Amino acid sequence: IIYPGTLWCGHGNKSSGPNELGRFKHTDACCRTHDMCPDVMSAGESKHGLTNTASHTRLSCDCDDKFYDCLKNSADTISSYFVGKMYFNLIDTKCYKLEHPVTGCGERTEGRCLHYTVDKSKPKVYQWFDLRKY
Amino acid sequence: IIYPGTLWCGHGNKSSGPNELGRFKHTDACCRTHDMCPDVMSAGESKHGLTNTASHTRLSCDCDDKFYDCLKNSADTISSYFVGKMYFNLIDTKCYKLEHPVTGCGERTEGRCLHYTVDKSKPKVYQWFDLRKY
Numbered sequence: 001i002i003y004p005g006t007l008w009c010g011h012g013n014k015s016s017g018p019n020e021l022g023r024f025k026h027t028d029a030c031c032r033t034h035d036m037c038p039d040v041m042s043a044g045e046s047k048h049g050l051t052n053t054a055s056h057t058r059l060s061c062d063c064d065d066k067f068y069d070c071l072k073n074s075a076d077t078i079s080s081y082f083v084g085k086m087y088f089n090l091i092d093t094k095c096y097k098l099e100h101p102v103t104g105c106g107e108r109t110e111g112r113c114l115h116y117t118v119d120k121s122k123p124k125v126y127q128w129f130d131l132r133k134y
Numbered sequence: 135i136i137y138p139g140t141l142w143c144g145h146g147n148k149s150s151g152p153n154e155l156g157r158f159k160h161t162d163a164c165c166r167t168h169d170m171c172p173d174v175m176s177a178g179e180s181k182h183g184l185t186n187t188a189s190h191t192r193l194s195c196d197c198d199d200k201f202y203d204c205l206k207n208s209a210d211t212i213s214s215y216f217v218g219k220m221y222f223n224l225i226d227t228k229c230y231k232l233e234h235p236v237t238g239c240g241e242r243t244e245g246r247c248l249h250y251t252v253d254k255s256k257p258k259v260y261q262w263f264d265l266r267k268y
């Protein structure tokens with residue numbers, strides 16, 4: 001599904017070229033860059049010792065954070081608000097990143113764990129994490 | 135979340151009156167009627183011996199079928215297509231209806247069971263069912 005008025009917001013993209021943007025050019029730009037994330041793992045793919053069991057793509061946390069900021073700064077506020085709430089709040093996805101082994105949490109916003117505890121004595125390993133609420 | 139361009143498509147509605155419709159007046163009309171379904175059970179509600187464990191409203195199958203036809207017949211085809219695919223294909227919801235106790239299936243379209251088998255000798259009971267694909 002791709003959100004009408006955009007070419008890149010949703011599963012994959014329906015752009016005819018790498019540089020095409022939709023009607024909502026600010027919101028779509030944020031999704032375009034998101035889709036072009038250097039490190040992603042497709043549905044059912046296995047990477048960094050992890051495996052994405054979702055029916056949608058899951059990306060590195062760096063890309064997901066940049067996406068968050070992009071949307072919050074987008075001039076197309078109505079469509080960005082919709083895409084932002086959907087992605088970060090309603091589809092219950094996760095991102096991966098290299099971090100010290102996690103030990104605990106302090107539900108920095110219930111439902112999800114934003115200030116988890118790590119063991120700083122053990123080398124970093126790829127793990128799954130919750131996103132901030134939009 | 136409510137789909138921009140509509141007042142009724144999404145959780146609840148953001149209409150100011152019972153008769154207000156959004157920009158996409160044909161798509162929105164279909165959602166308005168859907169929301170006004172005589173028999174629904176709110177998130178976590180218990181009804182007809184069933185209980186809705188979803189975080190969204192689940193309605194009777196009659197309403198969900200009427201909604202399907204409404205969308206397929208809507209003049210606002212782009213927004214109806216999006217709302218149709220999302221609701222019937224991606225959120226994995228269910229509807230309830232009075233039917234003979236179910237016994238089996240014949241995945242009338244994989245992922246979901248459209249031609250289930252019933253025991254016609256036992257009185258009808260409310261049960262949960264899959265929706266058609268849009």
Ligand SMILES: CCCCCCCCOC[C@H](COP(=O)(O)OCCN)OP(=O)(O)CCCCCCC
Pocket residue numbers: 001002003008009010011012013030031032034035036040056057058083086087091220224225
């Ligand atoms: C009800 C369930 C439907 C959920 C849809 C899942 C979208 C997947 O988000 C990942 C992609 C990024 O992954 P791909 O597009 O697969 O990545 C490109 C890598 N080839 O993010 P985006 O930036 O395109 C996200 C937009 C969601 C907005 C909601 C409006 C419908």
Ligand SMILES: CCCCCCCCOC[C@H](COP(=O)(O)OCCN)OP(=O)(O)CCCCCCC
Pocket residue numbers: 086090091135136137142143144145146147164165166168169170174190191192217220221225
């Ligand atoms: C990623 C997860 C998000 C899923 C959103 C769940 C929507 C609930 O559909 C039920 C209502 C009907 O229930 P209520 O609106 O709660 O019913 C009114 C009863 N007071 O249907 P509608 O006709 O309003 C459905 C539209 C979904 C379209 C997607 C675009 C965002």
Ligand SMILES: [Ca+2]
Pocket residue numbers: 008009010011012013031035
């Ligand atoms: Ca995309």
Ligand SMILES: [Ca+2]
Pocket residue numbers: 142143144145146147165169
């Ligand atoms: Ca609604």
